[PDB]
Structures are given as C-alpha cells and as structure tokens.
C-alpha cells in the first residue's frame, strides 16, 4: 500500500515494471515511483534488482537520482525516487545539435563527479548510455525494441575481446563516448550492425569533427584507449585542462558526501506536527531503513 | 505512375534515410514493394552495403527469398521493386500465438534452411539473420528479408565476442539455431539485461530445454548451436537431421536447385510485344539479367 502517495500520470510502461509521477502527500513534492512485479521476473532479475537497490541506498550525490523510500511486499516492490522533468540527454542533443565545449562542459563535469564518486564507493555502472542521462528542471545532470537498442555504441573493446569486463576502466570507457555525443551529437563508433560495430570499437578510432579544440581532442584521447588497464582513473582524468576551462579556481575534485544530518531540528520539528515521534525518526535515519518516516524527511530537504 | 511504371499506394515503412511504399506496377496491377532510398544521406560504409545488397539481391531467385523485380538508378535516388510480404514477420505471429507446434516449426525452418543454404552454395553468407528478417507471406510461408541493435545480438554467434573472424557461413548456421529455438520455445535460447549478461551466456552456450521439447528436436539444436566456428556441420548435412525430415520420409530436404532461365517464354514475350516493347529488348534485358523495365514486367507477367 503506498497510501502516503497520490499517483498522477504514468511516465514509462516496461514488461513487467511501470514508473508513474506522484505527489507525496505530507509535502507536496513530485516524485516518480517505480512499481517492480517481482512474480514475473526470473533469478537473474531479481539478483540485478535487489543489486540496483542496495547501490542505489548507498548514493547520495546532486547529479544521481536520489532514493527516498522503498516499499516491500511480497508481489511487489516499489522505489520512490527523485523525478527529473528534464528527460534524456540523447534526446535534447537530437533536438538541439551538438552542444558548444562550454555546455558540454557544465554537463560533462556533472557526469565524471557523478560516476568517479561511484568508484570511490566500490560501484561500477557498467552500462552507462545515453537513456542513463538525465536532465532535472535548471538542466542539470541526473544520472538514472529491448535492451539492447542504442547498446553496443557504448560498449568497450574487451566486451568483444572475450577478457573480463567489470572494471571501472569499463565506464571510462563508455564517459568517453558521451564526452563524443555531447560536442559532436554523434557516436564516435557506429554501425549497420553488430559486425560492423566491433570492428570501429576494436580499431578504436573515430572521426574529429572539425568544429573540436584539441582540448576536447586529448581529453577524449585519456578516455578512449583500447587496452583496458592503461586508461587513466576518472579521479586522473578530472585535472584534465578541458574538463577545466573557466574553473582555475576550482579544479574539478572527487566529490566529498557531506558529513550525515539525522537531527535537522527544522525537519524533526516539522515532523513531530505531522505526527511523528522523535524516537522513530531517528531509528529510521540512522537506521537507514527507507521507509515512511525517512521517506518524508530528505523530502522536506528541497 | 510516380516512378517508372509503378503507382505509389501506402507507405509501409519509415527509415532515417530509407522509404518502403506499397505499390501496384500498372501494366499488369501487380503489388509490389518499392524501397526508396536516399542514396545522398549515406555515407561510405552505407554505400558499400547497398551495393552489395543489390549485387546479392540480383542474383537470389529462390521461393523463400523476397525476389527483386526492378531496380531504378538515379544519381540521388536509389529505388528497388521487390516481391512483397504481407503476412509481417515472423517475431510478431510468435508473440502473438506463442511458440509453434513442432509440427509448424518444422514446415517453416525447412524454407528457411532451404533458403540460407542456397546462399550459401552461391557464396553468399548472410551474418545477421534475426526476427525481423523472416517475413511470411499470404499462405504463410517464409520470405526471407530504435536502431540498428535492438533484437541484434542474441543471434550472436560466440565468435563476435571473441575477437574472432566474423565471416563464415557458420556464423548463419549459429543464428538458425536461434531461429529454430525461437519457434518452438516462443523465446530467446540466450538473452540478458545487457551486452555483458548476454555476453556470458552466448560464450557459455547452454540453454534452457523446455518441458515439451522433442529429444528429436533438442538433437538438432545441438548441431547449429556449438561454440567452436570450425566445428559445426554444413547445412547441407543438417538438412539430413531427422527431426527436420518427421513426416518428409519420402521427401529428405536436399539443397535447393534452380529453374533453367525461362527467357524466351512465348505467352509473355508476346504480350509484351503487345505493349510495344521489342523482342530484342526483351531478350537482352533477361539474357543480361538488367533489371530495368522491360525486365521487371517480364517476370511481373509470372
């Protein structure tokens, strides 16, 4: 029962899954809630999913989508998350062209933070894509026919090469190949099919549009290398002089979480209003558990 | 009359850079299919598909290929009148009716067989068979045939991912395996949420066998679906598998032969004379094998 949310409009139907908008009714705020059947899905689904909700617990980052409560039951399981209005990044680029270094960059600086702070956290992405690129309200990064559609663009060489592929040098990879479609609004490996596809990604070479600074050149150079253990980690890649053009001041760094706040005194307040008991709004913060209670309290936090 | 001799009806299918319209060929009301292409918009690898497809297309006369009837050059604009397949693919009867009946599976996997070997004994070697290739016509039968990956690559053959040579007819002989998987079990033998998922297990090459899965079925499975390139039969032998010839004893699928050239048949020759073509034309245009307008309402007459 997810009674303390009013459904709105369905923004995505799957197989066995559907996302729709809703409002929170204690606060008014818009979130986006995905209703998972679990009675449909086999013992490798399951294993990816309940994957995707401990990650996805554990991240808290302003380019990742934030998670705010789940909600167990045995048929079903449903994850509330941040909404972002903004919709994908493939899809703007189609609309608009390329975007010029300078946007690329605000947008590619939000992507690498996003990602490298995965890494820091033992998390690899492993299928970053286009359909992964989120866009909120002021057009920030948010970070989310089959699934293989727009697939193998991403894919690095070792995929084709038989070697192991769970590296974060995987992802680097790939952040390669959206750094290209951002600038370019184009993939820089491409094909009518999955033969032709592997033979441009095995070659590793791509096509500089003559628009491109060299700047943006050797950054996609410290990405896009074929042998997997000599691409640089993404925290090396953030000193990169493109990655930081109009931020001297400011050199893009690993992101730092901030410290926990469990006792915002405004919210705890606010909540014990609402009807709450102190005791359990702490049990569920420092708990961790997702629930109502901690559901309703990074909400009152936008 | 919008192009050549040929009235435009529907268009049944949009492409980026490619048209399908349905059409009626008015000296002789025929349907047919008209693929327009905008031969401005490729680039060079695109032109070098097209070309090859059109060599290949010219040259295939078998009843379970879509035959080709004309094929009108112009400097921007590439047009080619091919048999048309109303019956749509065979993907979609599968999801609509679920998997067939051994007994159908079998009538349809023998044309198709049949089909892919004669290209092979031509010297032609397909390299992504998938779904959307095997299309049905009127009675049912095979005619063999968002972006380019979407379904692709569960008809893999292990060797993609192996950095291997992909360019073996054993590579269609691997996607007739999952054609013949996909028709009895109504679902892929090898499927994933990812590259990486899918990945495994094509390298791995086991798959479910279903309950009600013949033994006889489940043997003949195993002579298209074998890791090792070099180690799996011709079609040529696996039409002499026993689960493709049940109830076909006196019958053994056996490769395909041509017709003889009818060039010089008199109905038609004269009836065309009628249209005020001449008999030398005629010959020419068949003889030279020319596929323009004389030709195409020669074999049209059929």
Excluded at 45 to 69: A, D, T
């Amino acid at each position: 029962h997810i009674g303390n949310y009013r459904l709105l409009k369905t923004i995505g139907k799957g197989n066995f899954a559907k996302v729709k908008l809703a409002r929170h009714i204690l606060t008014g705020k818009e979130v986006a809630v995905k209703i998972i059947d679990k009675t449909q899905l086999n013992s490798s689904s399951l294993q990816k999913l309940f994957r995707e909700v401990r990650i996805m617990k554990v991240l808290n980052h302003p380019n990742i989508v934030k998670l705010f409560e789940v909600i167990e039951t045995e048929k079903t399981l449903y994850l509330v998350m941040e909404y972002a209005s903004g919709g994908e990044v493939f899809d703007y680029l189609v609309a608009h062209g390329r975007m010029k270094e300078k946007e690329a960059r605000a947008k590619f600086r939000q992507i690498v933070s996003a990602v490298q702070y995965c890494h820091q956290k033992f998390i690899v992405h492993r299928d970053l894509k286009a359909e992964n690129l989120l866009l909120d309200a002021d057009m920030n990064i948010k970070i989310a026919l089959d699934a293989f559609c727009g697939a193998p663009p991403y894919a690095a060489p070792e995929l084709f090469q038989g070697k192991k592929y769970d590296g974060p040098e995987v992802d680097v990879w790939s952040l390669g190949v959206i750094l290209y479609t951002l600038v370019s609004g184009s993939l820089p490996f491409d094909g009518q099919n999955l033969k032709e596809l592997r033979e441009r990604v095995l070659r590793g070479k791509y096509r500089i549009p003559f628009y491109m600074s060299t700047d943006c050149e050797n950054l996609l150079k410290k990405f896009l290398i074929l042998n997997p253990s000599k691409r640089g980690t993404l925290e090396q890649i953030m000193k990169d002089r493109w990655m930081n053009v109009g931020h001297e001041d400011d050199e893009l760094k690993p992101y730092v979480e901030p410290l926990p706040d469990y006792k915002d005194p405004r919210r705890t307040e606010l909540m014990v209003s609402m009807g709450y008991t102190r005791e359990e709004i702490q049990d569920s913060l420092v708990g961790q558990r997702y629930n109502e209670v901690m559901a309703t309290y990074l909400l009152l936090g936008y």
